[PDB]
């Protein structure tokens, strides 16, 4: 009876093993565009991915993680609301059973078909395990997906999924360039929050891009052929692996843009 996204182990149950589920800075949240205030003091965001080294893609039974070499400062996020240097460790997605849901963050209650999370750790804490124990430990870049024109830079991800169908399967995933997954604009919302899966630690500076990327129906259909289950177990399609919006509580969402 491990946590997951089913009727018996889904987000409404998580607080039993992880009481911080009902904490003061949980994610995701609804971004109310009429409430989020332009902050003229936010610096522009610095996304430095030219030296990024992808290694591996893993079905962890909740999502698939594209993992990067984070042993030196190769792929980093700086500026915006951040102090210092945050190293890219992995990216993954959350997605729906259908195009009308799947994002974790919502915009004026609108759900996107999917949401990309590029997870970075603060290099002043030395390792990822120590960073998650700190309020400023992680920076997650959130990007909404909508369904329309294919995203070319996502296709190398889509075409390896056949090979990692079930929990615990991985494959070599070298030389993938995450710059191919960004929108044109780096206009963003920011607020302090948490991991959106157990252990739900309150260690994240959230940076959610305003401009979604387009992916094709055929691309997201291939996300929905993945399995939550391990090899030879009853097939549970990997769909609706999103946590719903949490109470904002004592928090301000700041906009990078007028």
The answer to whether the annotation marks 190 as part of a ligand binding site is no
* Burial per residue of 16-31, b for 16 or more beta-carbon CB atoms within 10 angstroms, e otherwise: eebebbebebbbbbbb
DSSP letter for 109, please: T
Side-chain-facing half-sphere of 225: CA atoms under 13 Å: 14
Q: How far is the CB of 258 from Zn ion (least distance, A)?
A: 29
Instruction: At 212, list the tokens.
Output: 């979604």
Q: Is 197 annotated as a binding residue?
A: yes
Known binder of ligand: residue 92? yes
Q: What gap in Å lies between CA 145 and CA 31, rounded to an integer?
A: 16
Catalytic residue among 1, 62, 105, 120: 62
If contact means CB under 5 to 8 A according to the sort of partner, which of ligand BXH, Zn ion, none does residue 119 touch?
Answer: ligand BXH
Question: Shortest gap between Cβ of 94 and Zn ion (angstroms)?
Answer: 6
CB of 40 to ligand BXH, least distance (A): 28
174 known member of a binding site: no
The CA distance from 178 to 185, in Å, is 15
Indicate if 62 belongs to the active site: yes
User: In the complex with Zn ion, which residue's Cβ is closer, 212 or 258?
Assistant: 212
Q: Does 117 bind ligand BXH (CB under 6 A)?
A: yes
Nearest to 243 by CA among 45, 58, 106: 106
Q: Is 120 in the site for Zn ion (CB under 5 A)?
A: no
Question: Residues annotated in the binding site for Zn(2+), as ranges?
Answer: 92, 94, 117
Residues in contact with ligand BXH by the rule CB under 6 A:
117, 119, 140, 195-197
């Amino acid at each position: 009876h491990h946590w997951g996204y089913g009727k018996h182990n889904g987000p409404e149950h998580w607080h039993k093993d992880f009481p911080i589920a009902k904490g003061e800075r949980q994610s995701p949240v609804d971004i109310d565009t009429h409430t989020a205030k332009y902050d003229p003091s936010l610096k522009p965001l610095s996304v430095s991915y030219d030296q990024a080294t992808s290694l591996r893609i893993l079905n962890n039974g909740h999502a698939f993680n594209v993992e990067f070499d984070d042993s030196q400062d190769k792929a980093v996020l700086k500026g915006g609301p951040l102090d210092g240097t945050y190293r890219l460790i992995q990216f993954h997605f959350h997605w729906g059973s259908l195009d009308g849901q799947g994002s974790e963050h919502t915009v004026d209650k609108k759900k996107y078909a999917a949401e990309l999370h590029l997870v970075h750790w603060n290099t002043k804490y030395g390792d990822f395990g120590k960073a998650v124990q700190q309020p400023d430990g992680l920076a997650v870049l959130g990007i909404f997906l909508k369904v329309g024109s294919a995203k070319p830079g996502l296709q190398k991800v889509v075409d390896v999924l056949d090979s990692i169908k079930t929990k615990g399967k991985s494959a070599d995933f070298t030389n993938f360039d995450p710059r191919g997954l960004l929108p044109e604009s780096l206009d963003y919302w920011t607020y302090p929050g948490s991991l959106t899966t157990p252990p739900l630690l309150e260690c994240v500076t959230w940076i959610v891009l305003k401009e979604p990327i387009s992916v094709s129906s055929e691309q997201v259909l291939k996300f929905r052929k993945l399995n939550f289950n391990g090899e030879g177990e009853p097939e549970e399609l990997m769909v609706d692996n999103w946590r719903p919006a949490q109470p904002l509580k004592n928090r301000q969402i700041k906009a990078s843009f007028k």
